[PDB]
């Protein structure tokens, strides 16, 4: 049917992941959505896990690329006590606690449309925070949420195969700016450099400058 | 819709014509219980009534102030009003105020909740009453016609003297003198005085 | 995940899972407010 | 039932239907089951706003009015013992008696007003004041000698919405009193203090800054 | 076929038989997909069209004039006759005003055609986007290929203030003293013979205009938009 996660091979989970969802391939090997529940709510992890993760790669790689360009920019790994030694008036559970409640209020706005797809387009919110569904079958709420607000230029309004290529765009995207994230990590902790320093360490130098030559992954070399 | 063309009336500001001012200016729909419009039309009666004593009290005052016609009564800002010695003390001015503005007040009270039971005085006189926050105070008689019209006029004025009202307290705690004289350093040059170039108002600018 | 989370949620696994949060917290507030011997407010 | 909720997406509970003021449909704990308890809760609800909503305001009109040279009032925390200390002043255990008696008197007649809503309005109770106690048939509401401006009862709607915004400057007061508690317990500075030091710098004064809300030895 | 920014392609589907003039079928990405969305983006086209001749015409005059005047830096460096404050509030009033009258038609046409002062004066019913009536007293011939020369030569300037910045940012000059500074050496000037990158050295062009520049107390951050993307 589709391309598959490792092409041949017919032991594919049994028909939930069918060839429905975006970003679809079978890679299910350890049944962690096996549920459709637990499947539904894999695919809301998912999305969310990926524009978020999208963000903090976009603003890592913006603030590590400022950085080598000499401006007034800490690097990912340093910009918390890089912001409060230069913004000494402000508390540190005082920041906490305020993005606590705000993202609370977002989440649980984004929880009650998971319990409820239909429910967070009503009441304060106008009719375009309902959502457009997608996932499961549905037609209502869910990761993808249409309306002039969260699409106001309303590229996925009209031409459905449009629709298509650009939630696959979005769910591919996502998928590699995790693995980036989870690279940008590994490489701070085993350099001690920013994702661009390293990028541009192993393009000065291809040879000597892998990841064997950093005594953390090879932990003798 | 008058108030905002490309706007639609609340509904409840369209069927009633009968209102002065009705301007479909409702946005937060204060008065969609129609109790509470007539609360509030009552409200926008004495606020603006009030209002319009108040500044034209403080503009004529202001003016007698700047240019010089009474004598130490009239030459002290309106704000500081109280250092004047006057006729009698704070608090005997301030009680018999209570007392007389209790009794005119649930006077206009009892018209409010039973229209026309309280036109009639212990003397046997009676006054003419029509429609609820008008009682017909009208010796010499600019009512018989197009009323309607003389109450736009009054709603018009009473709005723009509350708002006038809002911005003398709100010049006074800004910036020093007299309203008039607001006025003037204002009309100095006048690219540069203004409300922004205050230090206490837009906060953003000057700490 | 069904079976697997109603395994989980099978009588052996739950009591120990709680006696486990359970004296972890317990263990935590000991670590962070030693030696209290009295509800001194 | 399509009333505004707590949680925009979470539906009442069974029982919160709608008709008592300020029925936004929250309990998560389920307090309320039982329909005597709930009447009960209902009417500790009542008494516990009346009393924050007076509580309150005779905290923060007397700051008020010391903080513009008015009056001068001292601390809400500290003005038992300003009057304590005074040439001529009751002393404490007498006056707790005396204000416990009255109250006694007072609340055991309110307590048999709720059990059977028509209690205290039999003839031969008191000295021909029993005609001030029937009751508007909702314990917690009395009427009668009380409510002598006559607010409300012209069009039952009109009491209604004055119920909830009564419930709503209740609750408003209550959580406003326990603010008033835990600032004073953990600043020992009034309430307008502690608004005026917090508009001063809202990153730095705070509660995560007065050094008693989160603990110094997680920290 | 037709008119087309790519010949020998087609036109993707919601700019199939366009009423807009200027229509070559592009939008790779799809931003006119939607119905509204189209005519909300035409209009916000249009403006930025004519804003944009006006920035662009402004700076050419301003320079012919005046050649000892950068015009980045115009703003902080003129002398006003006024002060900025209020002349800044006066420009914010008189054109949310004028804004607000233009999207509301845009919301709905038939809605404010109508002069607030006189009754008499309306302006007559027209396509959504051109006025027209008293603002356009003098027509030279037929409207359609006249609409086709504005929206064309819009574009032609919204890329003309583009090179115009960038030209600003990157030689610290005016753009026909940019453009006197390429003649006379082609095979130099350019950004491809100033801006090279190859896997191993970057090579970025110096930044002239000041990251900090104090303007009546105060100071701006107005640097160079974004350095370290620079080619
Ligand atoms: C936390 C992020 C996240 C989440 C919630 C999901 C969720 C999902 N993925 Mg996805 N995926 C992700 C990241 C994620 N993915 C990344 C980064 C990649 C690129 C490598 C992919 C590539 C991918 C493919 C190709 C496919 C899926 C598919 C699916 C769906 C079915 C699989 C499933 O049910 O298992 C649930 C998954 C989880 C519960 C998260 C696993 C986390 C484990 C428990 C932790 C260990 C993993 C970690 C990498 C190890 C290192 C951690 C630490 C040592 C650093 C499901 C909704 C399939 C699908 O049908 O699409 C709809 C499918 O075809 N994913
Ligand atoms: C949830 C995303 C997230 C992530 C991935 C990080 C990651 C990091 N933060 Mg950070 N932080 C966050 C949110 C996050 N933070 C928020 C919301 C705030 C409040 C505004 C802060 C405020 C903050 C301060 C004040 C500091 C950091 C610091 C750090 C770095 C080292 C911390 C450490 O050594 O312990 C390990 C951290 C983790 C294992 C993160 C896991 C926990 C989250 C919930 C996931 C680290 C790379 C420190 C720094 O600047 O480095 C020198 C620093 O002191 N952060
Ligand atoms: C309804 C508005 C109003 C009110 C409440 C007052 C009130 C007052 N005026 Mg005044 N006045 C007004 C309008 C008003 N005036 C107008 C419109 C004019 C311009 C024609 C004046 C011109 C005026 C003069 C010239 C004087 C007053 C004075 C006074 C004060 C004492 C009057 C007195 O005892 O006789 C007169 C007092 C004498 C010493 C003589 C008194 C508080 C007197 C004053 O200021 O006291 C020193 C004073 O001489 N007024
Ligand atoms: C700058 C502080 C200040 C304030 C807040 C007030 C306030 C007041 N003064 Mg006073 N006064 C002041 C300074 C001040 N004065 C000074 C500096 C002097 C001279 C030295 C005087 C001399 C003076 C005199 C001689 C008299 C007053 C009187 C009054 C009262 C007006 C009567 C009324 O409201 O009707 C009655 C009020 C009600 C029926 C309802 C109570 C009010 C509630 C809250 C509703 C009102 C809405 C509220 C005003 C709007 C919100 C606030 C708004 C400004 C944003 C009023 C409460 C008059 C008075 O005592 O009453 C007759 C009076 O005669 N003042
Ligand atoms: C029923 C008999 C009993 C009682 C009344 C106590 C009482 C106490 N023990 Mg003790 N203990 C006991 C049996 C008992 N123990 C036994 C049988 C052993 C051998 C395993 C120990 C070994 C032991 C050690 C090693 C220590 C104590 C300590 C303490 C004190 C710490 C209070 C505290 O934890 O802070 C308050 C706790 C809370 C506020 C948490 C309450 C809320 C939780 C989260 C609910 C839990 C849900 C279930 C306290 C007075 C500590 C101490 O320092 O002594 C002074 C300490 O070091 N105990
Ligand atoms: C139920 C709410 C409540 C409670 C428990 C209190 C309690 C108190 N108030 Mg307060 N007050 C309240 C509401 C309340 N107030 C309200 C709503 C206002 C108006 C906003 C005020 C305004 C107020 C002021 C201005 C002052 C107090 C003061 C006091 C304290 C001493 C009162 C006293 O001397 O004995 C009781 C007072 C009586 C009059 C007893 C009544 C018996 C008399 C003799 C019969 C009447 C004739 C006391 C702790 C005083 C204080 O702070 O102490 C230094 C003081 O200055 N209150
Ligand atoms: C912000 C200015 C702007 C706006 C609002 C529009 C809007 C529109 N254009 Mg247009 N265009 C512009 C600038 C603009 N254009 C410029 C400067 C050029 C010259 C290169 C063109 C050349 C052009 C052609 C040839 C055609 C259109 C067409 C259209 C219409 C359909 C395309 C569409 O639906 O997507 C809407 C477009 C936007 C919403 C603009 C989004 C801007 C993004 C978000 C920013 C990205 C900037 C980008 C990377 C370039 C950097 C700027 C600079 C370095 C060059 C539409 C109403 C087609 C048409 O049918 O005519 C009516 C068509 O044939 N345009
Ligand atoms: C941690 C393990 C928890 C896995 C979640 C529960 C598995 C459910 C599942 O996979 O469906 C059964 C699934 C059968 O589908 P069913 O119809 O739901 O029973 O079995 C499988 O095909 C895959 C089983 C793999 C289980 C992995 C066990 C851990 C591997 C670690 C290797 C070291
Ligand atoms: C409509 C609406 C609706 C929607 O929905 C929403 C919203 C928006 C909210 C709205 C709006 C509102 C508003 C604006 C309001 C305002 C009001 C006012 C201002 C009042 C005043 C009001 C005011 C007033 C009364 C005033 C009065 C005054 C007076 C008496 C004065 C007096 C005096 C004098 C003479 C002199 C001396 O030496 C001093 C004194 C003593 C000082
Ligand atoms: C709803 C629910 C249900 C679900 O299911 C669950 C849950 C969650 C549990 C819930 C919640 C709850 C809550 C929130 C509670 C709270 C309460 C309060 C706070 C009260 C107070 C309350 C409060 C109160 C009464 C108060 C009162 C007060 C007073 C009188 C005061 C007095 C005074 C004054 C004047 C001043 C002076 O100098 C002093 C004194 C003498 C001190
Ligand atoms: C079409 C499409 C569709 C698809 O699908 C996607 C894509 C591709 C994205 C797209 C797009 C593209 C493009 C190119 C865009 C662009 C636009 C622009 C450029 C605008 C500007 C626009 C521009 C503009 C307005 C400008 C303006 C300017 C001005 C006024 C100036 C002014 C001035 C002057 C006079 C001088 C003085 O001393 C100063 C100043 C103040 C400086």
Excluded at chain 4, 52 to 80: F, K, S
Excluded at chain 5, 85 to 97: D, I, K, N, S, Y
Excluded at chain 5, 171 to 183: F, M, Q
Aim: aromatic content about 12%; some cysteine.
């Amino acid at each position: 049917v589709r391309e598959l996660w490792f092409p041949g091979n017919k032991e594919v989970v049994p028909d939930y992941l069918d060839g429905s969802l975006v970003g679809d391939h079978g890679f299910d090997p350890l049944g962690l959505g096996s549920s459709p529940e637990q499947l539904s709510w894999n695919v809301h992890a998912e999305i969310f896990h990926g524009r978020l993760a999208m963000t903090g790669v976009a603003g890592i790689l913006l603030t590590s690329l400022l950085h080598k360009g000499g401006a007034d920019v800490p690097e990912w790994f340093e910009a918390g006590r890089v912001y409060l030694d230069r913004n000494p008036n402000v508390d540190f559970g005082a920041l906490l606690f305020s993005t606590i409640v705000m993202s609370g209020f977002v989440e649980f706005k984004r929880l009650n449309d998971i319990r409820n797809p239909g429910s967070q387009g009503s009441g304060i919110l106008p009719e375009d925070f309902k959502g457009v569904g997608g996932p499961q079958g549905r037609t209502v709420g869910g990761p993808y949420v249409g309306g002039r607000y969260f699409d106001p230029m309303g590229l996925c309004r009209g031409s459905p195969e449009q629709t298509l290529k650009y939630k696959w765009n979005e769910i591919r995207n996502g998928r590699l700016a995790m693995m980036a994230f989870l690279g940008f990590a590994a490489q701070y902790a085993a350099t001690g450099k920013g994702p661009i320093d390293n990028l541009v360490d192993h393009v000065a130098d291809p040879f000597h400058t892998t990841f064997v030559h950093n005594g953390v992954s090879v932990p003798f070399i | 819709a008058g108030w905002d063309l490309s706007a639609e009336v609340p509904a409840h500001l369209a069927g009633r014509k009968d209102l002065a001012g009705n301007y479909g200016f409702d946005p937060l729909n204060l008065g969609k219980n129609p109790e509470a419009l007539k609360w509030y039309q009552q409200a926008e009666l004495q606020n603006g009534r009030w209002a319009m004593l108040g500044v034209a009290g403080i503009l004529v005052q202001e003016l007698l102030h700047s240019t010089g016609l009474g004598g130490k009564a009239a030459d002290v800002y309106w704000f500081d009003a109280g250092n004047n010695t006057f006729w009698a003390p704070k608090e005997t001015l301030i009680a018999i105020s209570f007392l007389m503005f209790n009794w005119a007040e649930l006077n206009r009270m009892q018209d409010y909740i039973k229209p026309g039971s309280n036109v009639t005085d212990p003397f046997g006189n009676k006054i003419k009453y029509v429609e609820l926050g008008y009682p017909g105070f009208d010796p010499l008689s600019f009512s018989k016609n197009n009323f309607d019209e003389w109450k736009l006029k009054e709603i018009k004025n009473a709005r723009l003297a509350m708002l006038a009202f809002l911005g003398i307290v709100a010049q006074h705690n800004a910036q020093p003198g007299s309203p008039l004289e607001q006025l003037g350093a204002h009309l100095a040059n006048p690219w540069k005085n203004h409300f922004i170039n205050n230090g206490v108002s837009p906060f953003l600018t000057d700490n | 995940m069904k079976d697997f989370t109603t395994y989980l949620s099978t009588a052996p696994v739950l009591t120990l899972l709680s006696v486990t949060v359970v004296a972890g917290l317990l263990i935590e507030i000991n670590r962070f407010f030693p030696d209290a011997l009295i509800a001194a407010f | 039932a399509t009333r505004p909720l707590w949680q925009p997406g979470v539906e009442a509970p069974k029982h919160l239907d709608g008709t008592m003021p300020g029925d936004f449909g929250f309990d998560p704990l389920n307090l309320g089951v039982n329909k005597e308890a709930l009447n009960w809760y209902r009417n500790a609800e009542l008494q516990n706003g009346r009393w924050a909503m007076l509580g309150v305001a005779g905290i923060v009109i007397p700051a008020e009015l010391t903080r513009v040279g008015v009056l001068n009032v001292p601390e809400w925390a500290e003005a038992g013992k300003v009057y304590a200390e005074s040439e001529n002043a009751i002393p404490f255990a007498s006056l707790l008696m005396v204000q416990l008696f009255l109250f006694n008197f007072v609340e055991i007649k309110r307590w048999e007003d709720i059990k059977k809503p028509g209690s205290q309005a039999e003839p031969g109770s008191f000295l021909g004041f029993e005609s001030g106690f029937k009751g508007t048939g909702i314990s917690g509401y009395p009427g009668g000698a009380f409510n002598p401006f006559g607010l409300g009862n012209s069009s039952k709607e009109a009491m209604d919405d004055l119920k909830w915004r009564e419930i709503r400057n209740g609750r408003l007061a209550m959580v406003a009193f326990l603010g008033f508690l835990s600032q004073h317990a953990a600043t020992g500075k009034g309430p307008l203090d502690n608004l005026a030091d917090h508009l001063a710098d809202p990153w730095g004064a705070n509660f995560c800054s007065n050094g008693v809300s989160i603990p110094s030895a997680l920290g | 076929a037709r008119a087309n920014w790519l010949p020998g392609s087609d036109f993707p589907a919601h700019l199939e038989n366009c009423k807009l003039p200027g229509c070559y079928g592009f939008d790779p990405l799809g931003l006119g997909a939607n119905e509204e969305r189209l005519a909300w983006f035409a209009e916000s086209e249009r403006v930025h069209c004519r804003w944009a001749m006006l920035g662009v015409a402004g700076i050419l005059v301003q320079e012919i004039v005046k050649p000892d005047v950068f015009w980045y830096t115009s703003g902080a460096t003129v002398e006003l006759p006024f002060d900025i404050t209020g002349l800044l509030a006066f420009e914010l009033f008189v054109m949310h005003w004028v804004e607000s009258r233009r999207g509301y038609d845009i919301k709905k046409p038939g809605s404010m055609d109508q002069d607030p002062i006189f009754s008499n004066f309306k302006l007559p019913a027209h396509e959504p986007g051109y006025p027209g009536g008293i603002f356009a007293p003098f027509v030279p011939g037929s409207l359609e290929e006249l609409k086709v020369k504005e929206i064309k030569n819009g574009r032609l300037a919204m890329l003309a203030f583009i090179g115009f910045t960038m030209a600003a940012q990157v030689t610290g000059k005016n753009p026909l003293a940019a453009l006197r500074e390429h003649l006379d050496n082609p095979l130099g000037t350019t950004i491809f013979s100033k801006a090279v990158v190859v896997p191993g050295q970057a090579v970025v062009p110096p930044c002239a205009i000041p990251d900090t520049i104090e303007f009546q107390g105060i100071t701006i951050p107005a640097g160079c938009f974004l350095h370290s993307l620079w080619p």
